[PDB]
Symmetry: C3
Subunit: 350 residues, 3 copies
């Protein structure tokens, strides 16, 4: 089977010991307390679990004898036993790609990577515990943005004059990737370094998204800032604007923000985070109680140059529900209900 | 996505070459002959298959600069092509955890491990071929015990005065681990070395188990012995008592045993095993023909310090059926039918 | 869990550093244009995708102290993000086995490997892009041959007098491997080296295949040739004959061919390929428009001793449909429809 069978094994010189095995060992003990309005549902979903996000991966680089841009590749396993999920993960569930790189133009990767929008949404703006609201939370129809996506080409510019860099990508959609649709997307992000700050902007457009009996276009825009100061304070903040249009003429808008403050002293780092989705608007009218917010607090200990321990507390207050354009409840991160969470954790890189 | 995104990669020192890749290569060619009472079912289930239980794993230890108890981790793949099952296994399907260790108090592991009761059930008392009866075999409602389980904290004491040790654990249940229930369990085991013998005891309690229209509590108790003598004989034996109670008042009891005899001489080891589940009792009344037994023989050759070859024959006589508390047949290891099996195998550890 | 639990870990000497990690990194950017007769189906299936056939594997060899034939094993992961498929692959999805070897009698492998017939069908005769027609393409009932199959024992003879070798195997079928049937197969292939040519023959017989309300027997025969000349031309050609019989008396025949021509000069290789299935015959009558063909072209650049780049164009014209013996459409590689494809790719071996 395959584009070239096992011809590589049979005929090419094996480039032996030209790989690296790496891993992130990550374990979070997390207790949740739900207030869904059904006591049974609250017992099911709540309680204590262990969220094992450990993963193994493989990567390398090769300078080919007859091609100047260095070849690069990586294959990264999924999380091995996350909470709310069964055990076991395959290779290639996370960032998994091939590509090429040259000083003058940066790097191009083909495969499964983060979109430029998602990379900023995820880090810094989803940490700590903010993701349910700011990563996949939201009430808009269509697809606000992809996150980690297969069938993607992505270019990462170099750092021009030590200050400026661009991330750009296009790819197939979730259905297209299975031969079941013609969804696609593109997007771009930029970063400007500036004394102690960095400025971020990003865009993502998603086309031919099918959902709720309709085809959608999405556009999503974002701005934010980040700073680190010599006194040990650092922070971030962002604003995120989301628009969608359906094939039947319906328009939808919703916006959001996320911010964090952090103080690093000696081997410690304290951190507070807040993020919010505001009420959604459909065809000019606001839908009441379609907003979400989350507050979070964290302390982290630099236990080894290669590792950290952390404790964290957070409160999610989610929206009270909406219908999509087919008269059915639209799934949101709030569908399972309001919940709080206490957790401790460890992360180690080899 | 995740508790900390890719922050570990981006900010921590990579602790390079601080891992080990290991594996157990294991292949059993096994021929089964079924006598289910349906000739078609006998052809399907019987015949020759290759039971590939090979697996790969990853593990290590790290002495963190600011924490005295040594960090330990492991991630172990599932069996790659076992009989009765499709090809392929993910990482984390087997014992997969993080933890910490200190000479004075032993070791604590968090993640996916064997329960203390299951560890003694499995080894020595399931070998060879005794598992259909004594591992997952049985007729009791609820859950007699978990086996390999995610969402588990487990403490392994040291060997106190060279003689005594304890294994203790608690964790979430099979439903809880998916946010679909509030099942949990706890258990403990102890071991006492004593001239040529070791004595074992263990317990497991499972709570909020849903099955058959009811919530169950289970309690399981076990006692056994193991011995090795200078003449090359060794053996084991165990007695296992299982009780369950349902939310509607029904009580169930069933007990069981397993024993093995071995003679080790030069590069060989001969082995006979026997295990049995006795007739089940429900609300004081015995249910006839709800018992199971199995007899097994084996010869094994120490073909290398790192490997063994073996041949094995066994005969399983399973129970004739029972209904659970919803008037539906209750699945047991006997539901598929009586069968015999001849096998040969190899196992290698690197 | 398992034939011998964790006994190997606990009692055998760990044969440390006695393994190899290897991979093939393989990425094909492929654009398809379908002409199915439904424009919607054409958009879904067509478009651009990235077909990531990268995989990781593990292998090794061990000279056991008390057994002369060297022990061999391998475990090979599946493709990590192929087109038309979700992300992620487990270990053991590809050639995964244990075995033994001796210079005087060759090698025996037990596990999951290619059938002797399929190996010749796949390579040389499915490259480049010929597979939809000549690999899994066809209209015959039953199973023309297995491809990569678990539950297989396979013997690879040595090269007798530097000229002659045999590949032979038997194993369980797709249903048998899950305890759901008594299907099996056997097959054999031979190769005769002869100045610049090699002659191939092969056979496969499949028994107790259930499909379309009937039990089938299949027999498949193949002859071909291959040559490499010092001037830089090489080629291959094959003829493949497929017969089937059903339990209700129906007979089916179909034949096929595949050929390729190659010119290798300096760092380049040009390649043209053609393959065809001819009209199928059932109970002596030909069924019109049940044939398939494909033409393909390719250029490949030997970019490094360990790697290649390539570009490729191909045109598949498939059959127009048939019914199986139950009055329902029989699935073929033409069911989705005629399509063309342009692709570029890279392959690297470490
Ligand atoms: Na996605
Ligand atoms: Na379980
Ligand atoms: Na098959």
């Amino acid at each position: 089977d395959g584009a070239n069978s096992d011809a590589a094994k049979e005929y090419l010189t094996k480039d032996s010991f030209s790989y690296e095995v790496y891993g992130i060992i990550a374990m979070q003990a997390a207790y949740r307390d739900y207030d869904s309005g059904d006591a049974k549902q609250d017992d099911n979903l709540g309680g204590m679990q262990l969220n094992n996000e450990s993963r193994i991966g493989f990567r390398g680089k090769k300078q080919f004898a007859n091609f100047e841009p260095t070849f690069i590749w990586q294959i990264e396993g999924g999380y091995v036993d996350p909470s709310f999920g069964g055990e076991g993960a395959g290779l290639g569930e996370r960032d998994t790609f091939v590509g090429f790189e040259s000083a003058s133009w940066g790097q191009v990767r083909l495969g499964r990577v983060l979109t430029p929008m998602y990379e900023l949404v995820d880090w810094p703006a989803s940490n700590p515990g903010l993701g349910d609201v700011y990563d996949w939370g939201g009430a808009i129809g269509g697809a606000k943005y992809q996150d980690r996506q297969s069938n993607t080409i992505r270019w990462d510019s170099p750092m021009y004059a030590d200050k400026f860099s661009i991330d750009a990508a296009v790819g197939a959609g979730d259905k297209a990737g299975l031969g079941a649709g013609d969804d696609y997307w593109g997007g771009i992000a930029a970063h400007y370094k500036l004394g102690p700050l960095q400025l971020d902007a990003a865009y993502e457009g998603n086309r031919n998204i099918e959902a709720e009996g309709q085809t959608w276009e999405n556009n999503t825009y974002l701005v934010g800032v980040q700073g680190w100061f010599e006194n040990g304070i650092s922070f971030f903040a962002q604003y995120k604007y989301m628009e969608a249009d359906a094939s039947n003429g319906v328009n939808e808008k919703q916006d959001a923000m996320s911010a964090g403050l952090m103080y690093t002293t000696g081997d410690w780092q304290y951190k507070l985070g807040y993020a919010a989705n505001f009420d959604l608007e459909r065809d000019g009218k606001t839908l009441s109680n379609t907003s979400d917010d989350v507050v979070s607090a964290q302390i982290m200990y630099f236990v080894d140059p290669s590792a950290v321990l952390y404790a964290r507390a957070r409160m999610n207050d989610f929206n009270e529900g909406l219908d999509g354009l087919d008269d059915a409840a639209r799934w949101t991160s709030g569908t399972n209900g309001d919940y709080n969470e206490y957790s401790v954790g460890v992360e180690y890189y080899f």
